[PDB]
Structure formats: C-alpha cells, structure tokens
Design a protein around this nucleic acid. Structure first.
Ligand SMILES: CC(C)C[C@H](N)C(=O)O
Ligand SMILES: [Hg+2]
Ligand SMILES: [Zn+2]
Ligand SMILES: [Zn+2]
Length: 876
RNA sequence: GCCGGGGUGGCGGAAUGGGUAGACGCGCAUGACAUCAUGUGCGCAAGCGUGCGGGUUCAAGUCCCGCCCCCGGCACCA
C-alpha cells in the first residue's frame, strides 16, 4: 500500500485550481447570493513565514467553504506598496523602492501559492502604481471641493527616524508606530489635513449596530471620545477679545477663580505682560521641546506660569488671573479652561500649589462640606454662592446656566470630540503626490481633474530620494516648476505626499472594479459586492485603518458612489503566531541557573540568577546546544527581528502545505495566540496520514461500492455511523460559519477515529462510502490538496463543484442514549436506555448497575428526578 | 484609576435555555515490525477536584452576593 506523499500531489493541484479559475470573482454577483472574504493586504517588506500565513489561510478556508456552498465568492489580494513601510525597508538595504517592491511581491505571491491559497488575481492592485494612486488624488480633490481637506499651521509630531510628520493615530505609547523606541517631537509646520472630525458624530453613532469585536468598538468609542458640555466666553480685561473655554461642568461657572491657556495657545503670548514675557516665552520653548515620554516622567506634578493679564468672569463679573500651564492641551476643546479648584482635583491641586483662590459653589447633600476644603468635590450637589441659581440642583443647573449663557451671548452648549483631524501629508518620496499647486496671485489652487494623474518624479539616485528633514521632491524643479491652471502664471506643485494609510482606506472598494480608468470604481460594481462580509486581520489597526476606512466610506457614500456606510460588516481578528526562541547560553549548577549578561538582557528581566523552577514557571526550558552548552528557550513572537520565523518556502519543501495549514488552524482558537511548534507539525502529519490510509486501504473496496441507500432502512453500526456523520457535519458546518476552525477540525479528527472504529466490525458499506464522500468535502477547506486527491480516486470533477453536504436533521435524533445515574448529587454510574424510556424503565435498569453501586448507597430514597436526556437522581 | 477580555489537567484547549467537567490534539506510560493499539485530572487510599469565600438547588464551570489575580488599550480631554 502506497503512502501520503505531499510533494507528489500538492503543487499539481495548485496549478489545477489556477488553470480552471475557480476563485475568479464574478463581475456582478447573481442571485445565488455572494460572500466577500477579505484579509488586510500586506505591506510588501520582507519574506513571508508561518507567522504571516495564519490570516491568509483563514481567509482561504472561509473562502473555499463559501464557494463550495454556492455563494459567488470574491477573495481578492493586492499590495500596500506606497508609504513608509516599504520605503523604510528599501532604505535599510540601499535599494530603490520600485525595485524592492516588485521583488518583495514576487516572493510573496510565491509563498501564498505554495500554501495552496487561491485568489482572483485578475483584481490584484498595487498601490504605488499610477494606475491606482491616480484615484488617490481624484478622491483628494473631491474632498477639497467639499472642504474636508485643507492646510494649516500648528505643532505637528515629528519622527526623527522617519524624518517626517505623523498623524496622532500613528503615535503609540508616545512613540512612532513603526519605531517603538524612537520618541516623537513637535515642530511648527503647515501641513495638509483631512477634516475627519466632520464625521465624528456618525463614526461614533454608526458603531452601535455594527457587529465587531467588542474590544475594537470600545477603542474607537474612546478614541473619538464624545463629550457634551458648554463653551463659555471670558472677556479679557480692557482688551476687546474674548476667550472661549470648554466645560462639562458649567454649573460651577461662579466658582471659576482663574483661566489657563495652553502654552501653544495664541493668546498665551499676545496677552503675556512685558514684565512676564521673558518667562512665558521661556516656558513655551520648554513645553514644545519636552515630549510624551518626558511628560509622563514628571508625573502629575502641576506646573504653570502667570500671564500677567486678567479676565472677567462672565458670571460674578469680577476679575480672575490668567495663567498658562502644560496640563491643559491646545489640541482639545478650546485649549483654554475655567479653573474651578473647588470641584476638580486637577484645578484644585494647581490652585493649592500656585497660591490661587478656591471658591465653593456646589454644596454636598446632607453632610456639609468641611471648611476649609482640603480636596475637591466633583460629585453633584446643591448650588450656592452662584447668584440667582442658588439652591438649584447640580444637574438641572447645567442646562439652566447654559440656557442663561445662550441668552446674554456669553456662551453656548457645545459638544467637542477627542478625535483630532487627520494629518495626511508626508515629506517622503515614496508616496502619492498631492494634486495641489501654489500660485502667488491665486494662492493654493487644485489641479484639474482631467489633468490627473500627477506622476512622481523619476529618481534613480538612492542617496537622493532620502529624507533629511524636507521633502525629497523639494529638490527637483523639473517637477514643481509648473504653471497655475487658474491664471496662467508661474506656480509650484506641492512637494508633500499622501500618507500610506490614505491609499489603504478604500482599496477594498477598488477590488470590485480594479481596471476602471473613469472612476476609482463603478458604483454599480462596488454595491454588488460591498460590504465586506468578513475582514480577517489585526487589532493594532483599531484607531487607524479601521477608523480612516469608515470615514472614507462615509464620505464616498456622501458622494453617492457607495450605498453602504460601514465597509466591513464582519470583523474577525487573529492572534499572533509564536515560536520557541533561543535566548542564549546559561551556566546550570545544581538547582541554580546563573544568567550571563548577554542572555539576561534578551530575557528583559532584572534577575541574573534563577532556579530550575523560575524557568518552568515563566514558561521556559533549558535545552542542549550545538556549542556544547545549555540554552534557555522560551516562546516569542515569530518575527524577522527575533530571527525565529518559519519560512514558508523552505518548510513547504521539507514538509508540505496542508501540513502547515492543519498546524496553524488547529493550534488554538484563531482569536487567541498560538505557538507554532515541532510537536504540532507532527500531529498535522499524523492526522493527514491516517486520513490517507483509511481511504487508500479501501480504495479498491470503495471503487466497486455504491453510495446510494435508504436512510431509514438503516440499522446497526451503519445506522449509528450515519448519525455520527451528520452529527459531525453539523459541527463542522456551524464552526466554519462562526470562524471557529480549531474545533471545526477537532470535530473532523473525531469522526475520523469514529470511522476507524467502524471498520473493525463492519465492511465498506454504502453508508460508509457516503461517509467518505462527505468527509472529503468537509476537508476541502483545511486540507484542499489531500482532499482533492482522494476525492478523484472515485469522483470526476473537482471538489469545488461538489457543493457542501446537506444536513439531515432527522438523523441527529437519538435512540438509546447513555444516561447517568446519580444519587444525592454524586454520579454513581451510567445506564443505556432509550431517550423516552419511562422513569420505571430507567429506575429498573439502574438498580443493577455494573457494581450495583446505586445500591451500595441507595437504601432509603425519598424523591427521584428523571430527565429523559441523560440523568436520573435518587434523593436518599 | 478607567475601559475591554479572561482565570478549567503536565500543555493548547472543549463543555454554559444547571443535568456523567476535561471533547480533539500534544506530552507521558505499556504492548507490536518511526508507525499502530490501549491507558492517562489529583491522591496508594479513604476521598478531592473548573481563581477565593459564602449562598441557592436533588444537581453549580454554568445562577446570586462579596473579593483576588493576569493580559490588552488609554492615561491630567476640563
Ligand atoms: C489593510 C492594511 C492597513 C493592512 C496593513 N498594510 C498591514 O499589513 O498591516
Ligand atoms: Hg509602483
Ligand atoms: Zn518613524
Ligand atoms: Zn494663478
């Protein structure tokens, strides 16, 4: 008897599926229904390994399944070429991006193909190509006319490594999103923005009905951070100008004893007294230079300066000094606040430190407030010392005081958002050119829609297209020395480029019509496929892609190009793949494990001396090495950096594809993080072989048997096996739909054993043939190769045209289930009686269990409970 | 501190309209010419066992009250 040989059949079938084009995405989905499985396209930068294939596999499983059912499936794939990701890589190897990319893509598609993953490559999209980024511009225009795009000064975040500005969404832990070790600074610059805030309300409101992981939504809710409150205006003493401040506690206005402007606030210097200037101006240059990692280093220590100017409390009418502290942020609300030390610790503390007054205006219900106050009081209470509002409740106060303000034109009720506008301009070469020009008489003028695209200057000198603080395009007149399409005089093209995320915010839409030269996509098409039914990806893109993408769709909706309003209906996340890692040598002596500094450092711990326990307890092991010393191993993220990846190409050659799959899918729950291991790969081998044998050993026997039979006319092991099948089909089918591939397979392995047990007391019967047919169909999504192979030994056409097995509910019905006999809550034993078996029939079959255990303890009884299902309790 | 998700064998992990806890797999242990078959929660045993302590019930991983710990994300948003 032959044996399971991967290299023999895999690459064969792969070519087969590609030729016959089963995953070709239909232009316009018919009436059979349609699925749109999509995995976030990759940043071409490196070579793929098991750590990466997790996702694309999933997408494939899910994609093959649906296609098998009948749905018209669209499983697309393309490359997120432009932006920092690629450039940052091509720059670390002194290579030209256009070459480093097309190369990385080639390597990629090869891996994917080896893994037996199919796509509709006739839709492949490469962001960095003109044929695509042209539309990135077209959109930018449509956003300009609609006033959602714009330019403006102010402090922006600067990444010394990337040598360019980043959006707030790209500042994780106060560091770069790609360089989690490089702090971020601020620089006065005028960049281009996208008025995403214009959609703050909708972005937050349309989350509700969204069926996403509660973890993600909650992050967007928090990132958008809506807050209802009031915008009060404080007149400046003598001056004509008025200062707007936001507050979610206007019912305390009469308690405001001072104002605090953000260092970067304009009026912080335009009001700073000449005798204070030499200090105010020195404080700004101190805050601007400080950073996030530095600020969080000082703690909650309040620090500010007095502006030497006063303001007029529009409530009491009196004067209150105006200060400037860093604890107030300019990028939020009004960048100014009305300090009320009496009902806000922050303010309070700031007050007790810089000798400022604390006025009480909210009394605590019942238990009076200890005078003098030694801690704020932020809870609701009764108003006092607040003019005619005295006695008025706290809650009812707010709306009244606001209604009072909106009467004298002193303020108004407003709702600010934490969400800050999107900064999309980058001073890098590899990027989409902003379709704007700069005339001196006309000003900032938008390039004509029909003059698009605006190709990127062709630059070969690698040391040329490198960021040094300014836009690499700011050195090629041959590009920007163009004319203004308004007047006709000398103009200048904007040297800045669109951030990567821009093009990665509507790609899912391009796949629906990847070859359109009239529009970013034909609405008719996009509407037929959208929304994305299932989006496999990560969480790190919570406040980025998963946000920017929605805004983009909504705006595209508002142009009447896309019927839907949320691009991703389903959002399935995945966990990180891991692998046991070599953390260096160790000197073991008895039960003591000394740690040499080279290792201890990589382990990122303080201790330089553990024990054989501390090692176990932290999930590690000491193994023998090739250098003749012991090495401390431990799992770790499977990444290039860690140098522990399991390259696809190699692996597949030395093992097989379907093996990789089963290993990845069955390892754990997809949402959880797996740890790719030797032992696992083995299991995949075993599982796959046993599937082979079982079918190879009956190939002949099966070849001469018919798979036709009468359902009910079944009895014996057959009737049973047939039930086990359908019982299994249920599980597989459900789990595939819910995206629980692990248990979906665990169920397939279980039936397999069931088949081995059925063949020790029964021959290749019609029911059995059917079992095998059904099994092969249920396998096709996880091990499409080995599945397509065995299937052909008996049937003609591809498993793709087989369709998915039909469940037979009536086959699930159980007859003679095993029941547990318990007495006073302990499980004494288990009998085997029909499901409907009457209490008397069970009781009887119980009273004489294996060891009559039921008697060894039930010699009294008082009440008995029977549950047809699987239980019978005797209350002694 | 807030929000989100979780504590089950040696390990990944099953099972919640209460009803034989530990499916499937990994590891380990015996029997055959790396591969199969059998066993495998702990304790020699009384007996005990789903983070802790009470409680409801014939019956609790599932429900009720109080509490501990772990991971992830924001962290001075007025
Ligand atoms: C959809 C894209 C934002 C995915 C991203 N390019 C990544 O590889 O993480
Ligand atoms: Hg390109
Ligand atoms: Zn950077
Ligand atoms: Zn002009």
């Amino acid at each position: 008897m032959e044996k399971y040989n991967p290299h023999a059949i895999e690459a064969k079938w792969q070519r087969f599926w590609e030729e016959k084009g089963f995953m070709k995405a239909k232009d316009l989905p018919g009436g059979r229904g349609k699925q749109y499985v999509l995995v976030m396209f990759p940043y071409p930068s490196g070579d793929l390994h098991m750590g990466h294939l997790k996702n694309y596999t999933m997408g494939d499983v899910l994609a093959r399944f649906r296609r098998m059912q009948g749905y018209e499936v669209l499983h697309p794939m393309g490359w997120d070429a432009f932006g920092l990701p690629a450039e940052n890589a091509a720059l670390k190897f002194g290579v030209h991006p256009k070459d480093w990319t097309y190369a990385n893509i080639r390597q990629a598609k090869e891996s994917l193909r080896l893994m037996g993953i199919l796509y509709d490559w006739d839709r492949e999209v490469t962001t960095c190509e003109p044929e695509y980024y042209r539309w990135n511009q077209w959109i930018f225009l449509k956003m300009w006319e609609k006033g959602l795009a714009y330019r403006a000064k102010g402090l922006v975040n600067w990444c010394p490594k990337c040598q360019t500005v980043l959006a707030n969404e790209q500042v994780v832990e106060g560091r770069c999103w790609r360089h989690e070790d490089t702090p971020v600074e601020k620089r006065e610059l005028e960049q281009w923005y996208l008025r995403i805030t214009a959609y703050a309300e909708r972005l937050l409101k349309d989350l509700e009905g969204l069926n996403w992981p509660e973890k993600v939504k909650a992050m967007q809710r928090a990132w958008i951070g809506r807050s209802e409150g009031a915008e009060i205006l404080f007149p400046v003493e003598g001056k004509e100008v008025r200062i707007p401040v936001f507050t979610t506690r206007p019912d305390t206005l009469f308690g405001a004893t001072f104002l605090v402007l953000a260092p970067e606030h304009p009026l912080t210097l335009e009001l700073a007294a000449p005798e204070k200037r030499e200090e105010v101006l020195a404080y700004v240059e101190a805050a601007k230079r400080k950073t996030e990692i530095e600020r969080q280093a000082e703690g909650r220590e309040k620090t500010g300066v007095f502006l030497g100017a006063y303001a007029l409390n529009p409530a009491t009418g009196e004067r209150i000094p105006i200060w400037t502290a860093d604890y107030v942020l300019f990028g939020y609300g009004t960048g100014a606040i009305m300090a009320v030390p009496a009902h806000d610790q922050r303010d309070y503390e700031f007050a007790r430190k810089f000798g400022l007054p604390i006025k009480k205006v909210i009394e605590r219900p019942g238990e009076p407030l200890p005078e003098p106050l030694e801690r704020a009081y932020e809870e609701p209470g009764i108003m006092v010392n607040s003019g005619p509002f005295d006695g008025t409740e706290s809650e009812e106060g707010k709306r009244k005081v606001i209604a009072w303000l909106e009467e004298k034109g002193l303020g108004k009720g407003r709702v600010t958002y934490r969400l800050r506008d999107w900064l999309i301009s980058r001073q890098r070469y590899w990027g989409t050119p902003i379709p704007m020009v700069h005339c001196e008489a006309c000003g900032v003028v938008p390039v004509p829609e029909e003059e698009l695209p605006v190709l990127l200057p062709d630059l070969k000198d690698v040391e040329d297209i490198r960021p040094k603080g300014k836009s690499p395009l700011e050195a090629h007149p041959e590009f920007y020395e163009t004319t203004c399409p308004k007047c006709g005089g000398p103009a200048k093209r904007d040297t800045d480029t669109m951030d990567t995320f821009f093009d990665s915010s509507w790609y899912y839409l391009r796949y629906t019509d990847p070859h359109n030269d009239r529009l970013p996509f034909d609405p008719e098409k996009a509407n037929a496929w959208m929304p994305v039914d299932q989006y496999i990806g990560g969480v790190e893109h919570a406040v980025l892609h998963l946000l920017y993408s929605r805004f983009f769709t909504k705006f595209l909706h508002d142009l009447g190009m896309v019927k839907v309003e949320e691009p991703f209906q389903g959002l399935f996340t995945q966990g990180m793949v891991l692998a046991w890692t070599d953390f260096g040598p160790v000197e073991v002596e008895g039960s003591v494990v000394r740690l040499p500094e080279p290792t201890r450092i990589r382990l990122e711990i303080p201790e330089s001396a553990l024990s054989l326990e501390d090692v176990r307890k932290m999930g590690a092991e000491l193994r023998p090495h090739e250098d003749g010393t012991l090495h401390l191993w431990k799992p770790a993220v499977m990444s290039k950096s860690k140098g522990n990846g399991v390259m696809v190409g190699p692996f597949v050659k030395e093992q097989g594809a379907d093996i990789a799959r089963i290993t990845i899918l069955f390892a754990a729950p997809p949402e959880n993080e797996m740890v790719w291991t030797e032992e696992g790969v083995q299991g995949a081998w075993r599982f796959l072989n046993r599937i082979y044998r079982r079918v190879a050993e009956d190939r002949e026997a099966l070849l001469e048997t018919s798979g036709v039979f009468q359902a009910e006319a079944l009895e014996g092991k057959d009737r049973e096996l047939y039930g086990k099948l359908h019982e299994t089909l249920k599980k597989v089918t459900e789990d595939l739909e819910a995206l629980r591939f692990n248990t979906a397979i665990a169920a397939l392995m279980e039936f397999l054993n069931a088949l081995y047990e059925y063949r020790k007391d029964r021959p290749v019967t019609p029911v059995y043939r059917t079992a095998i047919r059904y099994y092969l169909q249920m396998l096709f999504p996880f091990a499409p190769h080995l599945a397509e192979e065995l299937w052909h030994w008996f049937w003609p056409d591809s498993l793709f045209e087989a369709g998915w097995p039909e469940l037979d509910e009536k086959a699930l019905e159980k007859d003679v289930v095993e029941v547990a006999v318990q007495v006073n809550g302990r499980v004494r034993g288990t009998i085997h009686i029909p499901k409907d078996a009457p209490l008397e029939v069970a009781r009887a079959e119980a009273l004489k269990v294996r060891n009559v255990r039921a008697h060894l303890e039930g010699k009294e009884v008082v009440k008995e409970i029977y549950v047809p299902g699987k239980i019978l309790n005797l209350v002694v």
